[PDB]
Design an enzyme around this catalytic site. Structure first.
Site, PDB file in Angstrom:
ATOM      1  N   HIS A  41     -73.124  92.034 -24.341  1.00  0.00           N
ATOM      2  CA  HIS A  41     -73.471  90.755 -24.973  1.00  0.00           C
ATOM      3  C   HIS A  41     -73.383  90.682 -26.516  1.00  0.00           C
ATOM      4  O   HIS A  41     -73.793  89.678 -27.141  1.00  0.00           O
ATOM      5  CB  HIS A  41     -74.835  90.304 -24.482  1.00  0.00           C
ATOM      6  CG  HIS A  41     -75.917  91.295 -24.735  1.00  0.00           C
ATOM      7  ND1 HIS A  41     -76.652  91.309 -25.903  1.00  0.00           N
ATOM      8  CD2 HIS A  41     -76.386  92.317 -23.975  1.00  0.00           C
ATOM      9  CE1 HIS A  41     -77.543  92.284 -25.841  1.00  0.00           C
ATOM     10  NE2 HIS A  41     -77.414  92.900 -24.673  1.00  0.00           N
ATOM     11  N   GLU A  72     -72.779  96.638 -18.508  1.00  0.00           N
ATOM     12  CA  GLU A  72     -73.303  95.933 -19.680  1.00  0.00           C
ATOM     13  C   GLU A  72     -73.023  96.669 -20.965  1.00  0.00           C
ATOM     14  O   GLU A  72     -73.889  96.740 -21.814  1.00  0.00           O
ATOM     15  CB  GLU A  72     -74.801  95.729 -19.545  1.00  0.00           C
ATOM     16  CG  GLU A  72     -75.445  94.927 -20.698  1.00  0.00           C
ATOM     17  CD  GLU A  72     -75.136  93.468 -20.595  1.00  0.00           C
ATOM     18  OE1 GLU A  72     -75.470  92.879 -19.558  1.00  0.00           O
ATOM     19  OE2 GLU A  72     -74.540  92.916 -21.537  1.00  0.00           O
ATOM     20  N   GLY A 146     -83.537  91.164 -31.166  1.00  0.00           N
ATOM     21  CA  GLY A 146     -83.173  91.927 -32.381  1.00  0.00           C
ATOM     22  C   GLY A 146     -83.003  93.421 -32.091  1.00  0.00           C
ATOM     23  O   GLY A 146     -82.367  94.144 -32.852  1.00  0.00           O
ATOM     24  N   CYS A 148     -81.396  94.886 -29.286  1.00  0.00           N
ATOM     25  CA  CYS A 148     -80.251  95.305 -28.498  1.00  0.00           C
ATOM     26  C   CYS A 148     -79.221  96.155 -29.205  1.00  0.00           C
ATOM     27  O   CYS A 148     -78.855  95.926 -30.345  1.00  0.00           O
ATOM     28  CB  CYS A 148     -79.570  94.103 -27.827  1.00  0.00           C
ATOM     29  SG  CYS A 148     -80.473  93.684 -26.365  1.00  0.00           S
TER      30      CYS A 148
HETATM   31  C1  LIG Z   1     -81.399  92.113 -26.364  1.00  0.00           C
HETATM   32  C2  LIG Z   1     -80.363  91.423 -27.273  1.00  0.00           C
HETATM   33  C3  LIG Z   1     -80.957  91.096 -28.618  1.00  0.00           C
HETATM   34  O1  LIG Z   1     -82.005  91.650 -28.929  1.00  0.00           O
HETATM   35  O2  LIG Z   1     -80.296  90.149 -29.537  1.00  0.00           O
HETATM   36  C4  LIG Z   1     -79.718  90.553 -30.801  1.00  0.00           C
HETATM   37  C5  LIG Z   1     -79.827  92.053 -31.072  1.00  0.00           C
HETATM   38  C6  LIG Z   1     -82.088  91.037 -25.513  1.00  0.00           C
HETATM   39  C7  LIG Z   1     -83.240  91.599 -24.696  1.00  0.00           C
HETATM   40  C8  LIG Z   1     -84.514  91.341 -25.484  1.00  0.00           C
HETATM   41  C9  LIG Z   1     -85.283  90.103 -25.020  1.00  0.00           C
HETATM   42  C10 LIG Z   1     -86.654  90.584 -24.525  1.00  0.00           C
HETATM   43  N1  LIG Z   1     -86.512  92.027 -24.685  1.00  0.00           N
HETATM   44  C11 LIG Z   1     -85.470  92.453 -25.252  1.00  0.00           C
HETATM   45  O3  LIG Z   1     -85.242  93.586 -25.616  1.00  0.00           O
HETATM   46  N2  LIG Z   1     -81.084  90.606 -24.545  1.00  0.00           N
HETATM   47  C12 LIG Z   1     -80.375  89.462 -24.676  1.00  0.00           C
HETATM   48  O4  LIG Z   1     -80.538  88.692 -25.618  1.00  0.00           O
HETATM   49  O5  LIG Z   1     -79.349  89.100 -23.692  1.00  0.00           O
HETATM   50  C13 LIG Z   1     -79.496  89.223 -22.269  1.00  0.00           C
HETATM   51  C14 LIG Z   1     -78.133  89.605 -21.675  1.00  0.00           C
HETATM   52  C15 LIG Z   1     -79.956  87.873 -21.721  1.00  0.00           C
HETATM   53  C16 LIG Z   1     -80.524  90.296 -21.907  1.00  0.00           C
END
Ligand SMILES: *[C@@H](CC(=O)OCC)[C@H](C[C@H]1CCNC1=O)NC(=O)OC(C)(C)C
Ligand SMILES: *[C@@H](CC(=O)OCC)[C@H](C[C@H]1CCNC1=O)NC(=O)OC(C)(C)C
Lengths: 181, 181
Positions: A41, A72, A146, A148
């Site tokens: 993603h 993923e 934030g 991921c």
């Molecule tokens: C991780 C992605 C993110 O953090 O965005 C920019 C780095 C997201 C998962 C977080 C939400 C709650 N806990 C987490 O760690 N995942 C995300 O945004 O995308 C999907 C695929 C929907 C998980």
């Protein structure tokens, strides 16, 4: 967990960088050569920011299990000349489980932060926001957006890349040796 | 730093909580009894949220050096019956310096996160956003808002409470034994 923090800090310092795509800002782990990995993603486009610098993306492999199921993870070959320390001997052949793990994040929002997430259990199948995904690790931790790309580690081991979460559970895509040559 | 992370995690788990005031969300360190500390700018009112629960604030002491100079710390006696483990033997008589330190944060924005900030040097005088403040520790770290109240630690030691920052420098108010009975 001290040894795990110590291994984490040294790994991050050596192989990690902050990456910006059109989809957000991510932690990125350099694996060997000029191949690194991002959570899928991150949908990296044809160019990325790597520690604030425009870097060209030669190739991008969005990984799937032999049955097509989503794992993923995107692998990207990077148009630069410096080579990533080879950490493939830190990656396992299969889903590592553990009792004391550390999740390392390294962005503008979480610069060099570490979280003792504790127990990591092979979770395998998960409906990852409408997407059936396999080879997941789970830990109990109130994860936040934030995070991921975060790198999941214990002493001596790179378990996976953080991809998902809800409330008090986070999930990493297991980072296995064979995804790499 | 492993030992410091290990001491940090155990300290946080034992003595720390997330506090919400009208001025924001803070990490809070319980010291002994029902006295805890917050960065001054938490300006706690007559009641606070402590891990999501309305708690009454009996008394609030905004500390100053004998010359009135700001030290940037508020002590609050808390209207609850449970008593904080006494950690005063972890607090020094004077500004601790160190080469490997850890900054522990514990809010909704940074839940149980740890940062290896590295070198902490008595800084003493600083113009803390127009306010001359003394007894500051400094470390080189790209600190971010949401981090105030963070607990600064090394193995065996609670150095201070995180109060200030600009870019790649953060500052803690040194947490000294005598502020407490
Ligand atoms: C991780 C992605 C993110 O953090 O965005 C920019 C780095 C997201 C998962 C977080 C939400 C709650 N806990 C987490 O760690 N995942 C995300 O945004 O995308 C999907 C695929 C929907 C998980
Ligand atoms: C810490 C206070 C804060 O984080 O707000 C809610 C928890 C602020 C210092 C951060 C800014 C850059 N680096 C930091 O760590 N300080 C603050 O907001 O107030 C003054 C007194 C201006 C420092």
């Amino acid at each position: 967990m001290g040894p795990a923090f110590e291994f984490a800090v040294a790994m991050m310092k050596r192989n990690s960088s902050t990456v910006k795509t059109e989809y957000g800002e991510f932690t990125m782990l350099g694996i060997y050569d000029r191949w690194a990995v991002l959570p899928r993603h991150a949908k990296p486009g044809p160019t990325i920011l790597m520690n604030d610098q425009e870097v060209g993306v030669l190739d991008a492999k969005e990984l799937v299990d032999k049955d097509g199921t989503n794992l993923e993870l995107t692998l990207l070959k990077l148009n630069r000349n410096e080579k990533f320390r080879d950490i493939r001997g830190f990656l396992a052949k299969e889903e590592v489980e553990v009792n004391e793990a550390v999740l390392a994040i390294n962005t503008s929002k979480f610069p060099n932060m570490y979280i003792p997430v504790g127990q990591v259990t092979e979770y395998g199948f998960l409906n990852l926001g409408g997407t059936p995904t396999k080879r997941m690790l789970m830990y109990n931790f109130p994860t936040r957006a934030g995070q991921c790309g975060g790198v999941l580690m214990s002493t001596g081991k790179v378990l996976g890349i953080h991809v998902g979460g809800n409330g008090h559970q986070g999930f990493s895509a297991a980072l296995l040796k064979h995804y790499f040559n």
